[PDB]
Design a protein around this ligand. Structure first.
Ligand SMILES: *[C@@H]1O[C@H](CO[C@H]2O[C@@H](C)[C@@H](O)[C@@H](O)[C@@H]2O)[C@@H](O[C@@H]2O[C@H](CO)[C@@H](O[C@@H]3O[C@H](CO)[C@@H](O)[C@H](O)[C@@H]3O)[C@H](O)[C@H]2NC(C)=O)[C@H](O)[C@H]1NC(C)=O
Ligand SMILES: *[C@@H]1O[C@H](CO)[C@@H](O[C@@H]2O[C@H](CO)[C@@H](O[C@@H]3O[C@H](CO)[C@@H](O)[C@H](O)[C@@H]3O)[C@H](O)[C@H]2NC(C)=O)[C@H](O)[C@H]1NC(C)=O
Ligand SMILES: *[C@@H]1O[C@H](CO)[C@@H](O[C@@H]2O[C@H](CO)[C@@H](O)[C@H](O)[C@H]2NC(C)=O)[C@H](O)[C@H]1NC(C)=O
Ligand SMILES: *[C@@H]1O[C@H](CO)[C@@H](O[C@@H]2O[C@H](CO)[C@@H](O)[C@H](O)[C@H]2NC(C)=O)[C@H](O)[C@H]1NC(C)=O
Length: 306
């Protein structure tokens, strides 16, 4: 077993050891390798060339930058199923996962991704089930960003942003999605058809965007949806005057910490909000932001009159 590592079968873990270099003598038989929470600032060229049996690799939480990710030439193996490069430096995409088509789990969270959003870099990853590109300084504009991800079930993309603060139809190929995190993306508007193909979606996180309205129409097709998180937006009205119901599958609607406008101008919307009581969570944290004389009051404890 390499120095400062723990070995079990073909698995090697060398985590939180303050390592500045990759341990020497890692055997070619290794199938899983974790070097997480260390101080690796660079990897010598072809350091992984002998690790041809690797199915799992995590380099999470180091100071690594990749001038050309990601390919079998970068990691030696062509049988990688799990790659975690989260909490690192700059990751530039020069190769579209050449030789890494077996990937099932991919994590880039809190690393600065470059040359990804303008292209369809995931085109070959027909087996990918989990993708995390949260907080990657990604500006979404090109609609084909996720082309190829037919099998995807979990998509986390929190802490990014969209051209024109607009959510386009970027999920149309992702029919197997069960979890979608779009929180903290500065969103203000969405395509009415953005979620129409997502019949298996169970959790949709829209928390801490910049929406001023809430409607039921974009969620009409979401007949597997259980949790809808709209906390921390600026919701005070709806596009449509006549709001319907959310899908019957829905169990939780989070509207806490929205800047509700408790005025006669929004009597109808607020009445509809009251009627969603059985869906709502922590109702004490649903408070009026305006007008001044009602600021801080729980929305459900108010009867607005004109
Ligand atoms: C927010 O509003 C609700 C409902 O609004 C109704 O309030 C009543 C008083 C009336 O003006 C009506 O036109 C409104 O639509 C308030 O809930 C109601 O509270 C009153 C007073 O406690 C209840 O009245 C009582 O009714 C029973 C018979 O049902 C009588 O025996 C009593 O004498 C008494 O009059 C009424 O039942 C409540 N409504 C129901 C059934 O939930 C609520 O208090 C109010 N909140 C505030 C303070 O803003
Ligand atoms: C708005 O309200 C919803 C519903 O109460 C909150 O959703 C909750 O979010 C947390 C954190 O994501 C979930 O906890 C997670 O649970 C799974 C196990 O199911 C576990 O693997 C994770 O480690 C984590 O603990 C929780 O399940 C979820 N609640 C429900 C009922 O779905 C949400 O946090 C609220 N939003 C904000 C910003 O407060
Ligand atoms: C989407 O998910 C479903 C599972 O709900 C996949 O369908 C299964 O596919 C396997 C073969 O890999 C079959 O053995 C199962 O019988 C299928 N389940 C049923 C009953 O439909 C489907 O392949 C996934 N789609 C993609 C493109 O990955
Ligand atoms: C939606 O995303 C937000 C973050 O954008 C989640 O809220 C955070 O939850 C974690 C627990 O995993 C806490 O450590 C943070 O303090 C929370 N942050 C905020 C914004 O208060 C939220 O849990 C997500 N919702 C769902 C349903 O998963």
């Amino acid at each position: 077993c390499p120095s400062r590592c723990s070995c079990s079968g073909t698995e090697i873990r060398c985590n939180s050891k303050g390592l500045t270099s990759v341990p020497t003598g890692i055997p070619s038989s290794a199938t899983r390798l974790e070097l997480e929470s260390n101080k690796l600032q660079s990897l010598p060229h072809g350091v992984f060339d002998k690790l041809t049996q690797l199915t799992k690799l995590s380099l999470s939480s180091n100071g690594l930058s990749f001038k050309g990710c990601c390919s079998q030439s970068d990691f030696g193996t062509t049988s990688l199923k799990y790659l975690d490069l989260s909490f690192n430096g700059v990751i530039t995409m020069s190769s579209n996962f050449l030789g890494l088509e077996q990937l099932e789990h991919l994590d880039f969270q809190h690393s600065n991704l470059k040359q990804m959003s303008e292209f369809s870099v995931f085109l070959s990853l027909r087996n990918l089930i989990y993708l995390d590109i949260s907080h990657t300084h990604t500006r979404v504009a090109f609609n084909g960003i996720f082309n190829g991800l037919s099998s995807l079930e979990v998509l986390k993309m929190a802490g990014n942003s969209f051209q024109e603060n607009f959510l386009p139809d970027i999920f149309t190929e992702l029919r197997n999605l069960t979890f979608l995190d779009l929180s903290q993306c500065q969103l203000e508007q969405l395509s009415p058809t953005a979620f129409n193909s997502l019949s298996s979606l169970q959790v949709l996180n829209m928390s801490h965007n910049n929406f001023f309205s809430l409607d039921t129409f974009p969620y009409k097709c979401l007949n597997s949806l259980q949790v809808l998180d709209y906390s921390l937006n600026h919701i005070m009205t709806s596009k449509k005057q006549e709001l319907q119901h959310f899908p019957s599958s829905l169990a939780f609607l989070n509207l806490t910490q929205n800047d509700f406008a408790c005025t006669c101008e929004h009597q109808s919307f607020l009445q509809w909000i009251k009627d969603q009581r059985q869906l709502l969570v922590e109702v004490e944290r649903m408070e009026c932001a305006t007008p001044s004389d009602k600021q801080g009051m729980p929305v459900l404890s108010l009867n607005i009159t004109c």
